Amino acid sequence: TPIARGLLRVGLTPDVVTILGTTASVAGALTLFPMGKLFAGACVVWFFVLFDMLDGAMARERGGGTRFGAVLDATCDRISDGAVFCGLLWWIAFHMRDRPLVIATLICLVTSQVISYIKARAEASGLRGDGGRPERLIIVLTGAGVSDFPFVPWPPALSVGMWLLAVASVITCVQRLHTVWTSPGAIDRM
Amino acid sequence: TTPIARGLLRVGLTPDVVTILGTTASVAGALTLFPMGKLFAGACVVWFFVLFDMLDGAMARERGGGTRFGAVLDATCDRISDGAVFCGLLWWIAFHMRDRPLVIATLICLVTSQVISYIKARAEASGLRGDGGRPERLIIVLTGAGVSDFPFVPWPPALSVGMWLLAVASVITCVQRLHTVWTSPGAIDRM
């Protein structure tokens, strides 16, 4: 929060900081992961996960965020996650011989979008759509970093990371739709 | 074509069930045919079930109302279905062609097909608008695919063309939609 104050000082808006963080996160994911630099990629993506929380600190230290800022931040989280899984997919698909893992990665790619989508769409209709994102990233990035750990790496960790997530994510989808289903007013006709 | 909705309502099928079955058939088709290189058949099937999913709305109108859950489920299903189309096409492109830029274009399409819808849903969740800039997206990629695998007289390049246009168009759409958020009433008031 002193960081947020100093970033305000220089002329950065919260929106600008989100876009730059997302741009840097995406570039990191798409530069490092396809090269097999999985640990470095993981550290950079975690960094910019954390660094993007500074948008809220900056908004608070300006007396307020905006609705657009909220929407932009969320959209950016989706873009950034898509980019994480796409970089990992590139490494996995073209530098390994684990097609089941390619499948698991694609499931993670799609479910990371859909899980968020269900929430936003549920809210757009006045229903709830949460339950079951930081921990999903924790799983896949820890798996990757350990797989490529600078010492005593455990290559299987990527696959374990991905497969767990893929299952966990699918369940989350089902869970979230259930929360939609059981929201008050969900079944009223209009 | 509301008598199909009439008859499916009679049998006891709700719009929600029809949406779930249509989406499942579309996903099975996309993930079964596209990775095999049967692009034309895959495009026909996906187009079929695109149209077949309109029957949920027909049933809702001829039922005195859809439901909120139904809307959410139908949209969620559209997202799943689009992910499946691009995932099957990607499998084909990535492992049975030698076109790395085309893989990139397909991944861009894969992600943007989600993000475009997301911007809309999230803006509405905040009381803003987030539309403008899907039917033509599928028209593009599926036409490219079907022509690429067109019976007897195929033109393979049509796939790469289809994807590359879509990828670009899709990126354009994303920024357009955010602009519509930005210009929504109340969007930039600080709170």
CB B101 within 8 A of CB B46: no
DSSP for B124-184 reads: HHTT-------HHHHHHHHHHHHHHT-SSS--THHHHHHHHHHHHHHHHHHHHHHHHHHTS
Shortest alpha-carbon distance between residue A151 and chain B (Å): 32
CB contacts, 8 Å: B79 with chain A: 113-114, 117
From first CA to last CA, the distance across chain A in angstroms is 46
Q: Which of B76, B114, B188 sits opposite A68 (nearest CB)?
A: B188
Residues of chain B contacting residue A71, judged by C-beta atoms under 8 Å apart: 119, 122-123, 126, 128, 130, 178, 181, 187
Using CA atoms, how far apart are residues A116 and A75, in angstroms rounded to an integer? 10
Asked whether the beta carbons of residue B76 and residue A190 sit closer than 8 angstroms, the reply is: no
Report helix, strand or coil for B67.
Answer: strand
Say which CATH topology domain A1-190 has. Answer: Four Helix Bundle (Hemerythrin (Met), subunit A) (1.20.120)
For residue A78, the chain B residues in CB contact (below 8 A) are 114-115, 118
- Let me know if A81 is a catalytic residue: no
Nearest to A180 by CA among B169, B121, B152, B170: B121
State the amino acid at position B117 in one-letter form: S
Minimal CA separation from A121 to chain B, in Å: 5
**Residue appearing with tokens 């994510």:** A169
DSSP H/E element including B5? helix B3-11
The answer for residues whose C-beta is within 8 angstroms of residue B180's C-beta and 6 or more apart is: B123, B129, B130, B131, B132
Is A15 within any annotated ligand binding site? yes
Question: The tokens of B15 are what?
Answer: 């719009």
Which two three-digit tokens encode residue B17?
């069930």
Tokens coding A185: 């007013």
Expt. technique: X-ray
| Calpha distance B154→B67 (Å, rounded) | 44
User: Domain segments of chain A: what residues?
Assistant: 1-190
- Portion 4-63 of B in contact with A at CB < 8 A: 63
Sign of the dihedral defined by the CA atoms of residues B91, B92, B95, B100, in that order: negative
Q: Which residue of A has its CA nearest to B121?
A: A121
Note which residues in 134-173 of chain B have CB less than 8 A from chain A: none
Take residue B155 and report the two structure tokens written for it.
């033109």
A180: which 2 tokens?
């939609």
Which residues of chain B does A184 touch, with a Cβ-Cβ cutoff of 8 Å?
none
**How many helices and strands, by DSSP H and E, does chain A display?**
8, 0
Interface of B with A in 86-115 (CB under 8 A): 87, 90-91, 94-95, 107, 110-111, 114-115
| Amino acid at position A90, single letter | W
Q: Are B155 and B96 in contact (CB under 8 A)?
A: no
* Tokens 């992910």 sit on residue: B83
* Distance to chain B for A120, nearest Cα, Å: 5
How many A-B residue pairs are in contact by the CB < 8 A criterion?
152
Q: Which residues of A83-112 are buried (b: 16+ CB within 10 A; e: fewer)?
A: bbbbbbbbbbbeeeeeeebbbbbbbbbbbb
Q: Are A98 and A163 in contact (CB under 8 A)?
A: no
- A170 known ligand binder: no
Backbone torsions φ then ψ of A153, nearest 5 degrees: -75, 160
A189:B66 CB<8 A: yes
Q: What is the DSSP letter of A150?
A: S
- Which single residue is written with the structure tokens 């809309």? B120
Query: Which run of H or E residues covers position A156?
Result: helix A156-181
* The CATH classification of domain B1-191, taken from the options 1.20.120.1760, 3.90.1200.10, 3.40.50.1820, 3.30.70.660: 1.20.120.1760
- Which of A70, A78, A185 faces B114 most closely, judged by CB atoms? A78
Residues of B annotated as catalytic (active site), given as ranges: 78
Do residues A17 and A7 lie in contact, with contact meaning Cβ atoms separated by under 8 Å? yes
